[PDB]
Design an enzyme around this catalytic site. Sequence first.
Site, mmCIF file in Angstrom:
data_model
loop_
_atom_site.group_PDB
_atom_site.id
_atom_site.type_symbol
_atom_site.label_atom_id
_atom_site.label_comp_id
_atom_site.label_asym_id
_atom_site.label_seq_id
_atom_site.Cartn_x
_atom_site.Cartn_y
_atom_site.Cartn_z
ATOM 1 N N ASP A 197 -6.773 6.447 -4.704
ATOM 2 C CA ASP A 197 -6.370 5.118 -5.187
ATOM 3 C C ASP A 197 -6.752 4.931 -6.662
ATOM 4 O O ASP A 197 -7.379 5.807 -7.259
ATOM 5 C CB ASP A 197 -6.962 3.991 -4.312
ATOM 6 C CG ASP A 197 -8.492 3.916 -4.362
ATOM 7 O OD1 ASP A 197 -9.060 3.027 -3.698
ATOM 8 O OD2 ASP A 197 -9.129 4.735 -5.052
ATOM 9 N N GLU A 216 0.797 -1.224 0.000
ATOM 10 C CA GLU A 216 0.000 0.000 0.000
ATOM 11 C C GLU A 216 0.838 1.287 0.000
ATOM 12 O O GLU A 216 0.391 2.315 -0.509
ATOM 13 C CB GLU A 216 -0.920 0.009 1.213
ATOM 14 C CG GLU A 216 -1.936 -1.126 1.226
ATOM 15 C CD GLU A 216 -3.218 -0.773 0.525
ATOM 16 O OE1 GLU A 216 -3.207 0.134 -0.332
ATOM 17 O OE2 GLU A 216 -4.244 -1.409 0.820
#
Length: 439
Positions: free
Chosen positions: A218, A209
């Site tokens: 994202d 991540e």
Amino acid sequence: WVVGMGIVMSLIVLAIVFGNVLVITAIAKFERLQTVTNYFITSLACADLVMGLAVVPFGAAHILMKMWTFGNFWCEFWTSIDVLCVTASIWTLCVIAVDRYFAITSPFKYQSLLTKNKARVIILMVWIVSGLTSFLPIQMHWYRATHQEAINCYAEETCCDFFTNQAYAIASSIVSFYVPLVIMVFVYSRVFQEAKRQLNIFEMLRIDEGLRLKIYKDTEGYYTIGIGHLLTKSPSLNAAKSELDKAIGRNTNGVITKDEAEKLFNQDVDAAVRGILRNAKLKPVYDSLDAVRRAALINMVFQMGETGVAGFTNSLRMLQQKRWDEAAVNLAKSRWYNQTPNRAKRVITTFRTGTWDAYKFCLKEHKALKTLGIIMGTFTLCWLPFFIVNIVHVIQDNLIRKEVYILLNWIGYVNSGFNPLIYCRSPDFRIAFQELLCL
Ligand SMILES: CC(C)CCC[C@@H](C)[C@H]1CC[C@H]2[C@H]3CC=C4C[C@@H](O)CC[C@]4(C)[C@H]3CC[C@]12C
Ligand SMILES: CC(C)CCC[C@@H](C)[C@H]1CC[C@H]2[C@H]3CC=C4C[C@@H](O)CC[C@]4(C)[C@H]3CC[C@]12C
Ligand SMILES: CCCCCCCC/C=C/CCCCCCCC(=O)OC[C@@H](O)CO
Ligand SMILES: CCCCCCCC/C=C\CCCCCCCC(=O)OC[C@@H](O)CO
Ligand SMILES: Cc1ccc(OC[C@@H](O)[C@H](C)NC(C)C)c2c1CCC2
């Protein structure tokens, strides 16, 4: 011809003295770099600067003039400095290897147990005890042969060739070089065996991540913060800050501290874990799995959620029957694989092998340890051949050309230039050289 060798040797001095003064400076000027580890790097650096300023240049004139045009007192002092720099450099390297060991087997993973002031005392000692053992034999003449060629060279002021006896040769090598080398290679092989062993769910999600302390989007386009903590699917930036302030419990203005990203992260991982145990389709698989494959599962549920990961109806049934390779082919047939390509690959590989191999050297603190490995590995390549030959000369003194000896020795000398290049792996260093150089 000889003019061509002069440039090489001249260029080589400059690189050592440029490269290392730059490393010494970086660390001296930028607080971010003042750490126990980089304090030892300074100790190494100085060894190399003394090597570059006081050893290599006279070695260089020695060769081209075919003689010692600098006198007796220097010759003696020149050789004791030469020894000092190699002795100190292996012992420092070894001491770094031991520091990183005690650091990585502590619950303060990656930090030194040593405080700064203790770092300095070790270094002083390493230099004092290196100094005494390097200067004393040479000055007190315990290093001296008793054959005609050698006793003749000690008298001739134009002669300064390194003739020694064998009790000096074998003793010093071992205590000065083999001992700390063997401990370095042995202890530092264990530091890698621990980086890998102590990989866990948290570092794995950290690698997959990343970390961002501002608000960002994202690949879906949704508003995320921290280590991939999702805030709101709605395209309203104030709705993101609305949930954030809620989720933290303060006015934030779209920015957060590291001691909040981590405590969000630990709730998201517990969230994922409780989701697997709550959900009927997941639980029974998760119990079949070992610690490393369980981490791969938690990763999935972090990304998609319990609902979504339950959808992989075939892949889950196989995983439970320990049919690792088949199920790895199913997970490749997925919307998941398509959208996020690399993350999927690394996760699947873990299910496939049951090992952390896909995250080898991916974490920043682990890349830091690889770099340290290279500095060690390169010392061993550059000095070891010479030190073996110095020892195979004592068992049969008719077996290796002086031209071979000088070459292999100079591979040693040229090792002083490589450490700085190798540090351009570190971003912390890459930026420091830049400010300094005024790029
Ligand atoms: C060239 C020969 C003859 C002499 C050189 C040896 C001496 C003066 C040098 C070489 C390495 C040096 C330093 C290495 C790194 C540390 C870090 C710093 O935070 C405190 C000083 C300290 C501890 C230095 C002490 C002095 C030192 C040991
Ligand atoms: C015989 C010839 C080659 C002499 C070489 C001596 C040089 C390289 C040595 C002598 C004293 C050394 C150190 C003195 C104090 C430390 C403090 C440390 O936190 C930064 C590096 C620094 C400033 C060292 C730089 C290198 C240094 C200046
Ligand atoms: C062989 C090719 C490789 C390159 C060889 C080049 C020539 C040699 C340089 C001499 C050594 C000293 C130079 C190092 C000094 C750099 C640090 C300094 O200038 O930085 C100031 C700082 O306070 C601002 O931020
Ligand atoms: C950058 C690191 C250090 C650099 C410092 C370089 C200093 C020397 C200058 C050039 C040559 C001098 C001129 C030559 C004068 C006499 C030559 C003599 O005939 O040499 C005999 C000998 O070499 C036969 O074996
Ligand atoms: C303890 C130790 C440390 C370094 C050593 O070699 C360095 C090499 O530049 C030598 C000095 N150069 C000669 C050609 C003079 C050696 C020992 C033991 C003997 C050889």
